[PDB]
């Protein structure tokens, strides 16, 4: 049952200290390492299965494989990621491009679509307007009271 591990070499099972972002191990809590068994990277006869990936296609067709083909499941969801998919440009308004899929109830079928994220909206532009306002306004106001005090200070001296 034990999985081969990328580039251990050897043709035998061993036990490594595995971590996060490492194959053959999903951490059950943050910082949890685990001594787990693992199979080598070299092919021996002790293999139950052996995954291969096809690089160059050969002479004849492979019935389950070359012949048939299967679709992706999800389409693009980000603004530009939709743009990039169909090849649009910055000013092309993705909204009318997003993938929609039909769902059948009993007698009322309907379609649905993502929720274009990262999409520039009237709302977003209003938020940037606020941040800008607050920053410059608060700066001037902080300079208002700055000189205001410095003059209140001179009259602790000049008098």
């Amino acid at each position: 049952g034990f999985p081969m591990k990328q580039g251990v070499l050897l043709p035998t099972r061993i036990k490594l200290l595995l971590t996060k972002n490492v194959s053959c191990y999903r951490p059950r809590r943050d910082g949890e390492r685990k001594r787990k068994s693992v199979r080598g990277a070299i092919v021996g006869p002790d293999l139950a299965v052996l995954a291969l990936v096809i690089v160059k296609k050969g002479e004849q067709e492979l019935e389950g494989l070359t012949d048939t083909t299967v679709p992706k499941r999800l389409g693009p969801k980000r603004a530009n990621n939709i743009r990039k998919f169909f090849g649009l440009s910055k000013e092309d308004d993705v909204r009318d491009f997003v993938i929609r899929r039909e769902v059948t109830k009993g007698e009322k079928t309907y379609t649905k679509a993502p929720k274009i994220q990262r999409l520039v909206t009237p709302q977003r532009l209003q938020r940037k307007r606020h941040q800008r306002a607050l920053k410059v306004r608060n700066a001037q106001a902080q300079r208002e009271a700055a000189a205001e005090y410095a003059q209140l200070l001179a009259k602790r001296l000049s008098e």
Partner: protein, 260 residues
């Protein structure tokens, strides 16, 4: 103990809340906030132990979650928020304006002030510092920092703050004579003038005091909270004016007021 503590065993809580002995193992335990947790007062204890506006601690939250209560003008919603001295608390939906200010025992009395006055408080300054970019600032006893202060303001002097703008609006210095509130110790709840400050280099200056009855008591500089001029308070003192009477004189005032 591997980190900060999160519980309060009901017995290790401050006595001046007057929670019962039985009826549970734990006390509220003030959250982190404006006042030191031992010197504070949770809103749960005010709103159900001190006002009886609630019974369950559940109904405490339900009141708070209604935003029914401001502290110093800002609407606070943490069940165990740590309110304290000079704070205001405003239950709007019933036209009530209080001010957590001391008993004559050492407790937080239910002191009701007007719909005005709640528009300000007082603040004992703790430090006066030169901040960065040359800006100066003071720090008051409730974790308020006010940048650009009156150069006259030194440490221990009190400060008249607004309550919707910050900003100091006049203040009082610490010299002989001033009217002083004791904020802890054996004389917590008492009020009086000054007479003397006995400074001690190395540490701990004591401040002799005299009330409006020619009784002289002493405390540590730490506990003294100036609140105005002789016979002239900058706020409304609770009943009894924090004058303190003996158990003898107590008993007489009881039986005499008792009957008729």
């Amino acid at each position: 103990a591997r980190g900060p503590k999160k519980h309060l065993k009901r017995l290790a809580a401050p006595h001046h809340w007057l929670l019962d002995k039985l009826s549970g193992c734990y006390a509220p335990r003030p959250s982190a906030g404006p006042h030191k947790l031992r010197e504070s007062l949770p809103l749960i204890v005010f709103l159900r132990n001190r006002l009886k506006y609630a019974l369950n601690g559940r109904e405490v939250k339900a009141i708070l979650m209604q935003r029914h209560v401001k502290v110093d003008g800002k609407v606070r919603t943490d069940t165990t928020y740590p309110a304290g001295f000079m704070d205001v608390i405003t239950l709007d939906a019933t036209n009530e304006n209080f001010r957590l200010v001391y008993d004559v025992k050492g407790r937080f009395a239910v002191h009701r002030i007007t719909d005005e006055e709640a528009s300000y408080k007082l603040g004992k300054v703790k430090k006066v510092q030169l901040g960065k970019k040359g800006v100066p600032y003071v720090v008051t006893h409730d974790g308020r920092t006010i940048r650009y202060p009156d150069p006259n303001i030194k440490v221990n002097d009190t400060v008249k703050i607004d309550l919707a703008s910050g900003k100091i609006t006049d203040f009082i210095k610490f010299d002989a004579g001033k009217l002083v509130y004791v904020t802890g110790g054996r004389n917590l709840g008492r009020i009086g003038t000054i007479v003397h400050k006995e400074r001690h280099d190395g540490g701990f200056d004591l401040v002799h005091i005299k009330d409006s009855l020619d009784n002289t008591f002493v405390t540590r500089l730490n506990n003294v909270f100036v609140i105005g001029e002789q016979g002239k308070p900058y706020i409304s003192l609770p009943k009894g004016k924090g004058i303190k009477l003996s158990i003898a004189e107590e008993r007489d005032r009881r039986r005499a007021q008792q009957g008729l």
